[PDB]
Design a protein around this nucleic acid. Structure first.
Ligand SMILES: [Cl-]
Ligand SMILES: [Cl-]
Ligand SMILES: [Cl-]
Ligand SMILES: [K+]
Ligand SMILES: [Mg+2]
Ligand SMILES: [Mg+2]
Ligand SMILES: [Mg+2]
Ligand SMILES: [Mg+2]
Ligand SMILES: [Mg+2]
Ligand SMILES: [Mg+2]
Ligand SMILES: [Mg+2]
Ligand SMILES: [Mg+2]
Ligand SMILES: [Mg+2]
Ligand SMILES: [Mg+2]
Ligand SMILES: [Mg+2]
Ligand SMILES: [Mg+2]
Ligand SMILES: [Mg+2]
Ligand SMILES: [Mg+2]
Ligand SMILES: [Mg+2]
Ligand SMILES: [Mg+2]
Ligand SMILES: [Mg+2]
Ligand SMILES: [Mg+2]
Ligand SMILES: [Mg+2]
Ligand SMILES: [Mg+2]
Ligand SMILES: [Mg+2]
Ligand SMILES: [Mg+2]
Ligand SMILES: [Mg+2]
Ligand SMILES: [Mg+2]
Ligand SMILES: [Mg+2]
Ligand SMILES: [Mg+2]
Ligand SMILES: [Mg+2]
Ligand SMILES: [Mg+2]
Ligand SMILES: [Mg+2]
Ligand SMILES: [Mg+2]
Ligand SMILES: [Mg+2]
Ligand SMILES: [Mg+2]
Ligand SMILES: [Mg+2]
Ligand SMILES: [Mg+2]
Ligand SMILES: [Mg+2]
Ligand SMILES: [Mg+2]
Ligand SMILES: [Mg+2]
Ligand SMILES: [Mg+2]
Ligand SMILES: [Mg+2]
Ligand SMILES: [Mg+2]
Ligand SMILES: [Mg+2]
Ligand SMILES: [Mg+2]
Ligand SMILES: [Mg+2]
Ligand SMILES: [Mg+2]
Ligand SMILES: [Mg+2]
Ligand SMILES: [Mg+2]
Ligand code: NA
Ligand code: NA
Ligand code: NA
Ligand code: NA
Ligand code: NA
Ligand code: NA
Ligand code: NA
Ligand code: NA
Ligand code: NA
Ligand code: NA
Ligand code: NA
Ligand code: NA
Ligand code: NA
Ligand code: NA
Ligand code: NA
Ligand code: NA
Ligand code: NA
Ligand code: NA
Ligand code: NA
Ligand code: NA
Lengths: 56, 73, 237
RNA sequence: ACGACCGUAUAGUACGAGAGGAACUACGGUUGGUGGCCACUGGUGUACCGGUUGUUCGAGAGAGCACGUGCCGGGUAGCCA
RNA sequence: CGAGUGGCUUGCUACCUCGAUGUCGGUUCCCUCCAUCCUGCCCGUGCAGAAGCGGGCAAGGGUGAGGUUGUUCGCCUAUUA
RNA sequence: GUCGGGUGAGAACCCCGACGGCCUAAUGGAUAAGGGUUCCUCAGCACUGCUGAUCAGCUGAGGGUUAGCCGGUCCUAAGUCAUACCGCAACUCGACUAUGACGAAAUGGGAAACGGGUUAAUAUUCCCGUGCCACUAUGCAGUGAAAGUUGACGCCCUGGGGUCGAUCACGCUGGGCAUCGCCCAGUCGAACCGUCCAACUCCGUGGAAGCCGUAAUGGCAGGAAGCGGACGAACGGCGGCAUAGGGAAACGUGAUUCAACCUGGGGCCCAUGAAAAGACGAGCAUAGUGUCCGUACCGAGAACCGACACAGGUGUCCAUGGCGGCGAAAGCCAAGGCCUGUCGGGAGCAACCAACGUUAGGGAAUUCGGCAAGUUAGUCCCGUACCUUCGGAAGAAGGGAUGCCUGCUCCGGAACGGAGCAGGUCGCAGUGACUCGGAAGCUCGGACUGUCUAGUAACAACAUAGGUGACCGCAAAUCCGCAAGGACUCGUACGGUCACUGAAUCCUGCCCAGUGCAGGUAUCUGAACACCUCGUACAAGAGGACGAAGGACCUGUCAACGGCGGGGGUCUUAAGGUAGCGUAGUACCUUGCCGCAUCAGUAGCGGCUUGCAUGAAUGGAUUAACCAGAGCUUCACUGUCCCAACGUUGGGCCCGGUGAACUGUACAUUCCAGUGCGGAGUCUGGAGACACCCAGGGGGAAGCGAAGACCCUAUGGAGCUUUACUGCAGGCUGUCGCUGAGGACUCUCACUCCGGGAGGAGGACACCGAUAGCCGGGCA
RNA sequence: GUGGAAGUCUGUUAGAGUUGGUGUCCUACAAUACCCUCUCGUGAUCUAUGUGUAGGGGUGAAAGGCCCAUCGAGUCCGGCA
């Protein structure tokens, strides 16, 4: 079976959804963890220095 | 017996399956009463259709050479 | 290279775990305050999914209902006893001290009260040879002479289901069904049939181990494969 | 846009001890190539006509579908070898 | 032993292309060369004849079918001018 | 699709009718996920729609989803999270152990709903009628009340009960047809309340010594049949519900086969087939309460995923519509749906191309190869070789039969079930279409079913049962983690880990020198601490004594890595190739030699065989069965070929509409030669050449497409290997700390493990922290 | 005779798979498609949903296969000009 188009047909599973805490469609309803803000994993807000250039 | 295996598996394998199952399917003398009505119910489990006595034995024989020794000593 | 299969095992992932939730009971000798008065009646005989051997359901006097490691020759209706003064008949459990030398025994404790550790598989048995006030010498199924505290409890008789190993599996499918009830990854791909990256015996233009198969005791995991600290190999001599 | 071969008469002759065995010329045919043609033979011919299976239109009659004819038998013109 | 011609083989060289000139063999379809295998016209013969052998002119036409092998090549079979 | 017609400024494709078609596990009906308003109405055509559009899933505006009894909700599953505890430098990190919570919308468990009616759009939700469940309150009954039952369960075979459907018979109602007398539709009516009860189990009677019974197994003096009785089923029968409802009308009765549903019997397991909430147990009247969330629509060749109105992908139920037949098969046809797998008009419609039909005579000559195509075919009877693991081979092969019509026989309770007989009779052909094997032999490989390179490899590769070796007594072996801890393990040697070989059958020789592993070890070597000597008012430092693991040394071991020659009638380096097999899928010479077979056979098979460079679990030989595996032979077959022809359908060609891309330094009508960085449309010399346009097959533009995969170069990269260099985990071992009392020893008090506790085992060891030596491609 | 076993046979039942055609397509209907052919189809079977394992790590009947068109070490951003 082709890994491309033919394998795209079984994709009717809901995972990432609108997050209660940040509003982004990143709350993974299976993991109950937001990949954008960290809700469900961290009380503190998800954030990293690599999200911007080193000297900025 | 091993006739269900057709021309598959070779001699030894089906010769022993037939031999083992042959003895397994023989009439067995119930330990409780003395009637020849003991049948295998599963792995190591034996039961008398006559009086219902359900007991432990070998996997394919109701009695094993080791179990017989116990009685003695 | 990559971690070898033996290393994937230790992580305890689903593929390597035993289907514990599907198991029936953790066979262990009952605890008795003392006196031995404890007796019960066999209510049924069941199949043990973790041992491919029968096991017995027992209702004890004080209301307790527990499955028991069943020796051969135990049936519904039988009365089993557990204690120092237990009669000396198959199916009963008592300390090696109260047991007459020369009698076959199973489910032997390693340390008094641990509930039983030795001789528990199909049709096997230990052999109580010597007694003493200090040591009870038992011969385990492997043939080893084991010195045990005479206070170690044991069950009279040989384990039920003897002879299971006498029948060949004949087909892959039968192994399959058994393996599904154990904590094991099956089937088994030979190391020499793998790539170098996956196993120390992997690689090559044809199949053969790269070095000799006997590996040192000190070899690290990932390398300890083949014949581990073999004192010898082959059949000759 | 014609190439080449076989056969007959020449002749059982010339030549030759014999065995064997030509030619010029005149004929008939074959093969390969070439161009055209369909009276003849052959192919096709889901034009056409008949037989017949299953099913549907109640039967009969007469029909549809079965891959672009259901299958089978015959086959005009034309096109062809 | 000596002097050459060809550019089909092999070797040599490293000029051309590494921001790619698609491989071998086969096939199909077209043109050509002559160092001519057959055919035409000839010369010599250890040319009686018949069948040959060798040579000259000559490239109009022909040079086919098969068995093994991917084979080119080559071996083999029956036809063939 | 076509002919008429409707609307409209405008109609091939928007709507009506007729005629003609397409879809039958779907192109129909109901839905899960997912989409998210796509649903309905009105108004529109700038956008989207493969052409057009008055149409629309498009644009704009409004409207639309109603629940005690359908789902959610509640329960618990694999498993997940939170808190506590502990770890970690630390945490948003981490395993265990507690507690708590989460975790199933078709498709797990589960209190309770049916029928009719209604809207443009909802509907077990609204309306009408009827029924039912739970909780609470009141009243009567009741003292019972928690034991038990249920929820609640695998795979295979099978009996009985039985509804719908389908079919048959006959009657009634309506319709169709018009030579007969046939053909079609209907003939209805729920939940619920009540009642009936087969099977299983049991009781009494009875008293079988051979009877009883089954599809089959089976049953019995431990009490068979018969007889009587207890318990006891359907989504089933029956009565009510119902001068409810529905129907234009009639508003049936019997039967067979019987999905659903109910209830039994048998067989299998080195496999044992959830749990919890809840229900029952545990009566009745009346009344009150029953909130919250979901509900439109699509569910796909246009509403989902695939950038698209994408020929792909995507779960469940309807598996009982008719004929057909073994059939959920084909073909044909209902119900229901559709003409939207959405551009049309024209030319006998040429060449050429895609699918395909038929081709005389020959019959594999084609070709790497029978690739492609063809042949055969269903069912019954007869008959069936080598070989074989006795199963098989086998549908071997081969031979015969096959329709219709008339009258019958047999099996069975019967079928609208099956098996036969006699007679008549038509065709070229009776499995008449459809459905539907070509067959046989030799050799190689792997035993077999199975697995695999999603996207050029399905194989001989992997797996497998079987054979074998290794480690380990469980405070284990093996493995994961930095740690806290963890998998194996609800396990315990008939175990489970680590490897090799790869069914069966006959077998599996010789070698321990090297390497590996393991055991032993007088002596030799072997680190650090402590100790002794020298040195230093101390220290650095030098040396000694002691000596662990390890090494030297010795031994064991090849189903451990591997080896099995040259020379002579021993030498390297341990042995010197045994049974077998052999020009091999291993043989350079090589198309080896002989034979078979063919006109001819580098092929194939057999024999020989000095084997460039066969050989025994790096398994050897051999082998029935199996195989989309490799090679070869025969019969049959045939357009593969001789050698091509004609035809069919869709294109191609012309016309309306829609409308890209690739590619482009410039110039460019070229051809023959030459030259040039040696492969020129453009330079040089000649030749030819009036321009534009249509169709064609692709000779050239070293045509387009891709900064060559080959090769080399770079003090480039990466994956992999090892007795490369250097290090790092990990294992072993000495030492110090924890650590205590009296080169060998006892004890108990730390510490560790077993025990519910009492206590037991072990014990200054082990664990842990630190350090030293050895091993150490496991890793960088 | 009964019985009805089997990693058993035939089989486009459903469903799974993917051998040949080196066909059609190859600016595709499609960044793995279409048709015919072909294999399996009671079991080591196929499948929905839920759920676990994560990057030198998983998973792997082992092909360096697979881990969202990405694999001899995923993807994203950062180190980084
Ligand atoms: Cl096992
Ligand atoms: Cl719902
Ligand atoms: Cl029955
Ligand atoms: K090049
Ligand atoms: Mg991928
Ligand atoms: Mg346990
Ligand atoms: Mg498992
Ligand atoms: Mg294996
Ligand atoms: Mg490999
Ligand atoms: Mg390695
Ligand atoms: Mg091998
Ligand atoms: Mg090997
Ligand atoms: Mg037709
Ligand atoms: Mg080119
Ligand atoms: Mg000349
Ligand atoms: Mg010429
Ligand atoms: Mg609409
Ligand atoms: Mg409108
Ligand atoms: Mg919940
Ligand atoms: Mg449910
Ligand atoms: Mg609706
Ligand atoms: Mg709806
Ligand atoms: Mg469409
Ligand atoms: Mg012909
Ligand atoms: Mg040939
Ligand atoms: Mg040829
Ligand atoms: Mg073929
Ligand atoms: Mg009868
Ligand atoms: Mg036919
Ligand atoms: Mg060969
Ligand atoms: Mg195989
Ligand atoms: Mg592939
Ligand atoms: Mg295959
Ligand atoms: Mg393939
Ligand atoms: Mg193999
Ligand atoms: Mg094995
Ligand atoms: Mg074994
Ligand atoms: Mg084994
Ligand atoms: Mg030979
Ligand atoms: Mg050997
Ligand atoms: Mg010029
Ligand atoms: Mg380059
Ligand atoms: Mg290279
Ligand atoms: Mg490198
Ligand atoms: Mg403990
Ligand atoms: Mg390295
Ligand atoms: Mg099968
Ligand atoms: Mg099949
Ligand atoms: Mg899943
Ligand atoms: Mg490889
Ligand atoms: Na290897
Ligand atoms: Na170039
Ligand atoms: Na060529
Ligand atoms: Na010539
Ligand atoms: Na040849
Ligand atoms: Na249209
Ligand atoms: Na009833
Ligand atoms: Na039918
Ligand atoms: Na199979
Ligand atoms: Na050795
Ligand atoms: Na050795
Ligand atoms: Na060898
Ligand atoms: Na197969
Ligand atoms: Na043809
Ligand atoms: Na061209
Ligand atoms: Na690499
Ligand atoms: Na029989
Ligand atoms: Na295919
Ligand atoms: Na990585
Ligand atoms: Na960067």
């Amino acid at each position: 079976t082709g890994a491309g188009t033919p394998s795209q047909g079984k994709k009717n599973t809901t995972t990432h959804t609108k997050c209660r805490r940040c509003g982004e469609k990143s709350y993974h309803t299976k993991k109950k963890v937001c990949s954008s803000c960290g809700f469900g994993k961290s009380a503190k807000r998800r954030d990293y220095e690599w999200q911007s250039k080193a000297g900025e | 017996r091993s006739g269900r295996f057709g021309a598959r598996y070779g001699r030894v394998s089906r010769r022993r399956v037939a031999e083992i199952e042959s003895e397994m399917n023989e009439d067995h003398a119930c330990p409780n009463c003395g009637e020849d009505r003991v049948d295998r119910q599963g792995t190591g489990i034996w039961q008398c259709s006559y009086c219902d006595y359900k007991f432990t034995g070998g996997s394919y024989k109701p009695e094993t050479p080791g179990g017989k020794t116990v009685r003695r000593s | 290279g990559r971690r070898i299969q033996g290393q994937r095992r230790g992580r305890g992932t689903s593929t390597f775990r035993a289907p514990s939730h599907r198991y029936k009971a953790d066979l262990e000798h009952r605890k008795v305050e003392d006196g031995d008065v404890i007796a019960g009646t066999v209510v049924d005989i069941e199949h043990d999914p973790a041992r491919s051997a029968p096991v017995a359901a027992v209702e004890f006097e004080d209301g307790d209902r527990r499955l028991i490691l069943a020796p051969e020759g135990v049936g519904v209706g039988d009365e089993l006893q557990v204690g120092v003064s237990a009669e000396i008949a198959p199916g009963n459990t008592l300390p090696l001290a109260e047991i007459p030398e020369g009698v076959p025994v199973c489910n032997v404790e390693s340390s008094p009260g641990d509930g039983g550790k030795f001789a528990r598989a199909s049709g096997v048995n230990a052999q109580l040879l010597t007694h003493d006030r200090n040591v009870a010498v038992v011969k385990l199924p492997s043939g080893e002479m084991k010195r045990l505290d005479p206070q170690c409890r044991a069950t009279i008789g040989v384990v039920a289901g003897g002879g299971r190993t006498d029948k060949p599996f004949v087909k892959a499918g039968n192994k399959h069904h058994k393996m599904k009830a154990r904590g094991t990854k099956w089937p088994n791909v030979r190391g020499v049939a793998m790539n170098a990256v996956d196993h120390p015996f992997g690689g090559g233009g044809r199949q053969h181990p790269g070095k000799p198969k006997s590996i040192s005791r000190n070899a690290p995991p990932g390398r300890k494969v083949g014949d581990i600290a073999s004192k010898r190999t082959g059949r000759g001599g």
